[PDB]
Amino acid sequence: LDVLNKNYNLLEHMQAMRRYLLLGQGDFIRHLMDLLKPELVRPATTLYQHNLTGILETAV
């Protein structure tokens, strides 16, 4: 349990996933979902992925 603390932060990633898939802190997801709605109202296309990585990175 001490080698993960020095190198990998294993149980820190247990708390970390709760902020994104379990939506612990809402400001990470509300500033997401505000910027994400002008893309979700249209149907998805082939060109749907390359803007979503940019709208993820300017939301964080």
């Binding site: 060109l47 992925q49 390359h50």
Partner: protein, 64 residues
């Protein structure tokens, strides 16, 4: 390389002195339709990270 062959014809046009001008504009719109064909070819690729970079920059040239 069709861009190169239409530039030498249009440079010859200016030093010689409308139907050739309309032929050049139809040569451009054939290139602009060919660029839309490569946009559909790059969308139907292997869908990797290199696909995303080449499909973003050609949507970007299409927005020009």
């Amino acid at each position: 390389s069709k861009l190169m062959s239409v530039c030498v014809m249009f440079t010859n046009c200016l030093q010689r002195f409308e139907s050739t001008i309309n032929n050049f504009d139809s040569n451009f719109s054939a290139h602009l339709m060919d660029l839309l064909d490569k946009l559909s070819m790059y969308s139907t690729s292997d869908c990797e990270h290199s696909m995303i970079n080449i499909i973003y920059r050609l949507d970007f040239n299409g927005f020009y």
